[PDB]
Symmetry: D2
C-alpha cells in the first residue's frame, strides 16, 4: 500500500525527483508513473540477451503528433534504434518529409478558416502550415514518383506503403527526418491508408501525368503481422487512437497478445470506439496478454511523451550505443 | 434573434414538436436542430432537377449511378456498424439516399457477420480476462462471440479463393471498394448495408481495409492461396472523382479518423463541400483531425467558405436515428 | 441475452418505437434505455400506496441547464409535483427568475468576448444574455431584499438559501418559473453556494445600501439530509456534476444509499473528479445502495433529458393529477 | 512567427531545456509554455513595488496581509487535495506566493484528515460493493479508509463545541472562511495547507462548505450541540473586496465548478483579472461554466479584454507541479 504524496518544493527543484513523484501524486500522474515503469520493463527486456532483440517494440502515433514537436521525440527514438516497428497514418509520413523543406508554425485554435484560407494558410489544431509547403512537397515528390512507376514496370517492384515510406525517407536524405532514420536503421513503417493525406493528393495528380502506380496493402499486412508472430516478446507504445492503435494491437493478437502495453491518448470509452477503449477491452480480444499490466495515460501526448521518453529511453542512451 | 425556449410538456407528448423544439433549447440540442436543417438542405438540393449544363458536367464520371443535384458522402466508424446504427445506415443505402460510403475495416466485416450471427448487449465494465476465458470479445458495451469469426471464416474463404482466381485468370484488379461490392453481392441478404450498396451502385471506400477481421482472413488465406492484391491508389482516384464531378456535395460524418478525413479530402478536390454535418465525440484540444471543428476544415478548403457546417458533440448511437427521422425518413416518398 | 438491433425506418416513423429501440442500439443509446427503465421504476415506486410518497425523488441540475430550454422541462416536472427535492447552483435559481423578465437568445460558441462585451452581451455556451437582463433583475430584486432584511431583524426570520429561493419563486409570481411552482407545491430547493452568481452580486451591492442579510447554510444541510433520512425510498436524477451531484448523493448516504439513480452528464472519470465519477464509485461510499442498478448516460442533457421525460414522467401525467 | 520544434534528446536529458521546449511543441504543450509565461508575468507584477498612489488604494482593505502589486487567486477542486497536488498547494501557501484560496468542502477537510491518516493509491476499476464491504472509499484511483473519517470526527467534535460556545457567548459570527482559518489553526501541522493559510493571513473561501464530511460532522454535531450558523453573505463581501482593491489580479484555477466561477465573479467586480491561467479537463460543448474557454469569461468582464488568458486542457495532477517548478519555485528567494 502506497500513500499519496506529491513533490515537496521545499527540497528545491530537482526535475528527476519531481517526475518520480508523479507516481504517488494520483490520477493520471500515477498512471504516468506506471507507464514509466512499463516502458522501462520493455527496455530491460529488449536489452536481455537472446537484428532480433528480446523485445520487439511497436511505436504508433497519429498524424497530428508529427505536425507537433513530438516529431523530434519520435525521430530520436528511431535514430537510435530504440523501437522496432512504426505505425502512423498518412499525415504522419508526409509532414515529417515536408518539415525538411519548410517549417510549421504556432498559431491558435480559434483562428477563423475563412481568413486563414484567404491568406493561403492551413490550420492543424493550434499549428499553421502555409499552402507553399505543399507546393515544395509536390516539386520534391513528382520526380521520385516517376522513378517509382518506372521501377515498378521495369524492375518488378511491388510497392506497398511500407516500401514507399522507406524510399521517401531515403530520398529526403535529412538527419532531421523520422523516416530518413527509419530506413537507415531498417525499422519498417506501416500505414494501410497511406493515400489519406497530401501524399495521396500527389499520387492522384501524378497518376494523370504518369499512370500505373499500385500500392498493395495485403503484403504490408503480412509484413507487420510476422513482425509480431516471430517476436520473443513485444511491447506496444501507442500515442492516440484510430488505425494506428488497432493495427498494432491486431498484429499482436496474432502472437496471442503483447507482453507490455502503454497507451497515451485523449479518447474516452463511452462512445464504444476502439480509440477510446480501455486496455482491458483489448485483453478480451487477446491483443494484450492476460498476465500483462497495460497502462493508459489519459492526456495530450504533446505534454506526456517527452517526459516519458526522458525517464525511460533517454536514460538508457548508453545501452543503445 | 431567436429566444431560448424548451418544449413544454404541458402540450402533451407531441414527438414532432418535441424534436423541433431542440433548435431553441440550447447547447447540443440546438446544434441538432441545425444539423436537421443542413441535412434537409442537402436533400432539398439533391431532389433539385439537374439543368442541361449541370447534367453535362455531372455525367462526366464513369459510374452508372444516376446523377443527382447533390452527391452525399456518408462516413461512419467501425463500432457504429457493431451498434444498431447499422440498421439506420442500411435504410439510407437501401433507398439510395446517399451516394458514397466510407467506413473502416470493422465497418464492412461486422455488417456481413451480423447476417451470420448476432451481436449482444453487455456492459463496459466486463473484465477482459473472464470474457476471453469464455470466448467473448468486447466492443464498448456490446459482446461478440469468437464463434462469429469462425462462421465468417467459413463464409469468406471460398470467396477469397474465387477472387484470387479471378485476379490471376480474368485479370481483375482488386481495390477495397471492388472487394466490398463483391462481398455485399455474396452476402446476398437484405439486412446487409453492403448488399444494398452494390445493388444500388453506391461505392464504399476503406483505404485501410486490412485492419480488422477481414484482414485476418486475407492474411491466413494468403498462405494457402497466395497472391491477393488490394490496390488503394485506384480507389483514391475513384473517390476523388466522385467529389470533383458533383454538382453539389454534402458530407454526413459519424465519428472521426480516416472516415472523416478521407471524405473531407475528396471534397477539397472540388474546393469544398457545400453542406457538412458532423456527429462525433472527439474534442479539438489535442490537435487531432478527429476532434477538429468544421472551421478547421474551412481553412483547408475541405468545406466551402460560404457553407454553414454543423457539428453535434454527441454519441451518434443516440443522435443519428433522430436526425434520420427528421430528414431522410420524412422524404421517403421522393426516394421511391 | 439481448441482440443488438436498431430501429428500421422501413416501418416508417413512429417516435415512440424509435425511442424504445435505443435500448437495443448500443453504447449510450442503450444506457438511455436503461435510464428510461430506472426512472420508470422510481415513478412506479412513487405511485405505490403507503405529503410523503413511496419514493422521494431528488432532481439535480447545473446552472447552464436553466439558461437552456431544459428550463421548461424542469418547470413541467415541478409544476406537476413529479419530483420532491430540487438542487441547483446559483445561476440555476436566478436565470429562471430573469427569464420571466427578459429572454435569453441563441448564439454560437465561437463569438469573441471582446466584441460581445463591447456590445453589452454575455455569453453562456452558445447562448446570449444582454447586460440589460441583469439590470431588470436588480430593479425587481432590490425591494424584495429590503423586505427580507426587515423580516429577518423584526420577525425573527433565519434565512437559508432554500427559504430565500421559496420567497423569490413566490415573488416572481409567474407560471413559467420553476421556482414559482416549487414553492407553490412545497418542493424545497437547495443551493449551498447561492452567493455564486448574479443573485450574489445583488446581495453584495444591496448589503451596502441595507446591511445585515444573513444566509445560513447549516440549517439547509439539516433540511436536505432529513428529506433523505425519513424517505421510504429515494431516487436520484442528476443532470451534470459538481455541487448538485454530490450534495444530493451525500444526503442519500445518510439513509445508506439511494434506491434508484440516473445520471446524465458529460464529465469523465480520469481526472479523479466527483463530477466524472461513475456511479460505481458512489456505491463504495454508500451514496447508492449496493443492490441498486444506477445508470449514467454520457451525453449533453439538453439533448437527452427531454427525451427521457417524454418516455417516463410525461407518460404518467394521469397518475400525477 | 515561431516554428514548431520539439526538444531534441540528442542534447541529453536537460530538464530545464526540455520543459522550455514545450512552448514550441504544439497543442497543449504549447499552452503549457504560455501558462508558464503568464504565471511568471503574474509573479513579476507581484514583485513590482507599489507606488504611492497604488499603495494608497490597495491598503483600503481591512485585511492585515501585506499589499502586493498583484493579488493572486488560487482555486482548486476537492479531489486535487486528495491527490498529491496537496503538497504543491501547501508549498505556495506556506511561502505566501498566492493571496486568496478558493476550494470546495472536500478541499478543506481532506487536507486536515491527511494530518491524521493517509490516502492510498488504488485503481479506477475497483468495484464499489467489495470496497464498501471492506470499509474503503474510492476517489478516482485513490483510496480512503472509513477509519479516516472516524479520526476526523474525534478531532473535530470538540472544536465544534468550542465554536458554538464562542458564537453564543463571545458573539462570533462564523462564515466558511473564518471556520477554515480556525480549523487550520487547530490542526497546527506544517503539512497542512490551511495551517499555513491562517498563519500567513491567506483567506480561504468555500460557499458550499457543508457539502462534504465536515458538513456531515456539523450535521451530527448540531443534534447534540445545536445552533451553529455559517453565513455565506459576509464571505461574499470578503472575497469580492479582495479583488476590488487589488492593484492587479491574477487567477490560477485548477478544475471547474464553484471554485472557478467564484474567483472569476470576484474579479468581474474590478472589471476583470489582469492575468488568468486555467488547467482543467472540462469541455465547452455542453455549455457548462466549467468547460467554458477563457474567452467566454472575457464577454462577461471576468477577464480584462487586454489580458492574454491561457487554458491548458489536462489533468492538473500532471501539469501543476511542472508549472510551479518553472514559475513560483524559480522565484523562491524573492518570497523569503
Ligand atoms: N495531421 C492531420 O490533421 C492530418 C493531416 C493530413 C492527413 N491526415 C489524415 O487524417 C486521418 C485521421 O487521422 P489519425 O487517425 O492520424 O488521428 P486523429 O487526428 O483522427 O486522432 C484520432 C484520435 O487519437 C487521439 N489523439 C490524437 N491526438 C492526440 C494527442 N495529441 N494526444 C493523445 N491522443 C491523441 C484522440 O482520441 C483522437 O480522437 C489519417 O488517416 C491521416 O492520414 C491527418
Ligand atoms: N468495431 C470495432 O471496434 C472494430 C472492429 C474491428 C476492427 N476495427 C478497426 O479499428 C480501426 C479504428 O477504428 P475507427 O477508425 O473505425 O474509429 P474509432 O473507433 O477509433 O473511433 C474514432 C473516433 O470517432 C469518434 N466516435 C467513435 N464512436 C462514436 C460514436 N458512437 N458517436 C460519435 N462519435 C464516435 C470518436 O471521437 C473516436 O475517437 C479501424 O481501422 C477498424 O478497421 C474496429
Ligand atoms: N450558467 C452559468 O454558466 C452560470 C451563471 C451564473 C453563475 N454560475 C455559477 O457557476 C458555478 C459552477 O457551475 P455548476 O456547478 O452549476 O456547473 P458547471 O457549468 O460548472 O458544470 C459542471 C459539470 O457538469 C457537467 N455538465 C454541465 N452541463 C452539462 C450538460 N449540458 N449535460 C451534461 N452534463 C453537463 C459537466 O461535466 C461540467 O463539467 C455555479 O455554482 C453557479 O452558481 C453559473
Ligand atoms: N474529493 C472528492 O471527490 C470530494 C470529497 C468530499 C466532498 N466533495 C464535494 O464534491 C463537490 C463537487 O466537487 P468539486 O466542485 O470540488 O469538483 P469536481 O470534482 O466536481 O470537478 C469539477 C470539474 O473540475 C475539473 N477537474 C476535476 N479534477 C481535475 C483534475 N485532476 N485536473 C483538471 N481539472 C480537473 C473537471 O472538469 C471536473 O468536472 C464539492 O462541493 C465537494 O464539497 C469532494
Amino acid at each position: 500500500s502506497t500513500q499519496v504524496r506529491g513533490y515537496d518544493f521545499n527540497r528545491g527543484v530537482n526535475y528527476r525527483a519531481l517526475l518520480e513523484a508523479f507516481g504517488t501524486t494520483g490520477f493520471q500522474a500515477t498512471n504516468f508513473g506506471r507507464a514509466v515503469q512499463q516502458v522501462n520493463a520493455m527496455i530491460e527486456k529488449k536489452l536481455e540477451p537472446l537484428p532480433l532483440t528480446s523485445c520487439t517494440i511497436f511505436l504508433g502515433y497519429t498524424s497530428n503528433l508529427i505536425s507537433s514537436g513530438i516529431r523530434e521525440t519520435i525521430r530520436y527514438l528511431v535514430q537510435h534504434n530504440m523501437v522496432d516497428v512504426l505505425v502512423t497514418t498518412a499525415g504522419g509520413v508526409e509532414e515529417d518529409l515536408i518539415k525538411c523543406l519548410a517549417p510549421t508554425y504556432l498559431g491558435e485554435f480559434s483562428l477563423r478558416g475563412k481568413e486563414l484560407r484567404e491568406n493561403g494558410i492551413n490550420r492543424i489544431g493550434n499549428l499553421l502550415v502555409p499552402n507553399e509547403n505543399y507546393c515544395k512537397f509536390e516539386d520534391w515528390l513528382m520526380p521520385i514518383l516517376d522513378q517509382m512507376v518506372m521501377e515498378q514496370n521495369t524492375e518488378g517492384v511491388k510497392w506497398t506503403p511500407s516500401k514507399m515510406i522507406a524510399r521517401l525517407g531515403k530520398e529526403i536524405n535529412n538527419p532531421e527526418s523520422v523516416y530518413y532514420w527509419a530506413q537507415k536503421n531498417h525499422i519498417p513503417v506501416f500505414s494501410p491508408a497511406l493515400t489519406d493525406g497530401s501524399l495521396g493528393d500527389m499520387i492522384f495528380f501524378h497518376s494523370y501525368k504518369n499512370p500505373g502506380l499500385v500500392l498493395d496493402i495485403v503484403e504490408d499486412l503480412r509484413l507487420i503481422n510476422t513482425q509480431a508472430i516471430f517476436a520473443k516478446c513485444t511491447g506496444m507504445i501507442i500515442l492516440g487512437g484510430g488505425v494506428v492503435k488497432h493495427h498494432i494491437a491486431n498484429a499482436n493478437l496474432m502472437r496471442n497478445g503483447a507482453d507490455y502495453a502503454v497507451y497515451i491518448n485523449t479518447a474516452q470509452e463511452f462512445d464504444g470506439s476502439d480509440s477510446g477503449a480501455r486496455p482491458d477491452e483489448a485483453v478480451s480480444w487477446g491483443k494484450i496478454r492476460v498476465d500483462a499490466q497495460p497502462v493508459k495515460v489519459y492526456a495530450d501526448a504533446s505534454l506526456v511523451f517527452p517526459l516519458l521518453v526522458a525517464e525511460t529511453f533517454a536514460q538508457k542512451m548508453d545501452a543503445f550505443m
